[PDB]
Amino acid sequence: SFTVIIPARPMIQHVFEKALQSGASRVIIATDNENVADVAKSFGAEVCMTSVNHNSGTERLAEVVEKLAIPDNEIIVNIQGDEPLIPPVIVRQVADNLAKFNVNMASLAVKIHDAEELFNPNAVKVLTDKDGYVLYFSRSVIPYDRDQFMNLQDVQKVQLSDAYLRHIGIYAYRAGFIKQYVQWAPTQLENLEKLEQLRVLYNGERIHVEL
Ligand SMILES: Nc1ccn([C@@H]2O[C@H](COP(=O)(O)O[C@@]3(C(=O)O)C[C@@H](O)[C@@H](O)[C@@H]([C@H](O)CO)O3)[C@@H](O)[C@H]2O)c(=O)n1
């Protein structure tokens, strides 16, 4: 029974329409610009004006849940306004993962098939435990393949033995958590890597990442 919020600081329309297929019972475009608000409104969207003063989608969602009075317990699925494609079915998966795996933040990943993105700092790497509980997210390749990378010359000699995972920009969290998230001070960790999800891990909170 989730609600979708798309942080949007036409690309957005695709996220928007992919969102509609998700089964979301509400899809809001979160923006900080009149031009985006109007454009968003032009494709039949509920819009929420937010301030410029947010360094992350999660942070912007916090204001959105306040302004709209989204009840604490409502499940919010942040679908970053830059998402390539989302089999909408997955969105329902992550949302239900909150209670399935007993966590305040659920997310998703995809099996990496090209090794060149292992080493791309804009391709965020994620790695979990046996149940999908995240160990760490990084712009650096994780895990490290000592035997293949130690004095590695060709990215194409690299054998990705189903070890690698690329993080997708979709979060599932109840409004109340987004409020808590932003009640935490920004971390050095999230700020070095520029990855909002690292505030949850740093605050001793766990994250679930589904394949
Ligand atoms: N101050 C900001 C910055 C971003 N956004 C919203 O956040 C999304 C940005 O996604 P991103 O910038 O592409 O996101 C990152 C990224 O670094 O690409 C950031 C990071 O927090 C983390 O969530 C990773 C994921 O790991 C997905 O790779 O995704 C955009 O839709 C934007 O409108 C925002 O509202 N306000």
Helix 11-22 to helix 34-42 angle (10° resolution) is: 50
Euclidean distance between CA atoms 11 and 20, whole angstroms: 15
88 CA from centroid of ligand 1 (Å):
19
Second-level CATH architecture of 1-211: Alpha-Beta Complex (3.90)
CA 206 to chain centre: 14
Residues paired with residue 209 on neighbouring β-strands, in sequence order: 107
Q: Give resolution in angstroms.
A: 2.7
197 CA from centroid of ligand 1 (Å):
10
58 CA from centroid of ligand 1 (Å):
9
Q: Tell me the two tokens of residue 67.
A: 């302004």
Tokens 């360094």 label which residue? Answer: 55
Euclidean distance between CA atoms 24 and 145, whole angstroms: 40
Please calculate the CA angle 47-208-186 and round it to the nearest 5 degrees. Answer: 60
CB 63 within 8 A of CB 5: no
Q: Whose CA is nearest to atom 31 of ligand 1?
A: 81
8 Cα nearest atom in ligand 1: 33
20 CA from centroid of ligand 1 (Å):
21
Q: Whose CA is nearest to atom 16 of ligand 1?
A: 195
Euclidean distance between CA atoms 211 and 194, whole angstroms: 23
Peptide bond into 88 cis (omega under 30): no
56 CA from centroid of ligand 1 (Å):
6
Method: X-ray
| Protein residues whose CB sits closer than 6 Å to any atom of ligand 1 | 7-9, 54-57, 60, 80-82, 124, 167, 169, 194-197
Q: Give the total residue count for the chain.
A: 211
30 Cα nearest atom in ligand 1: 35
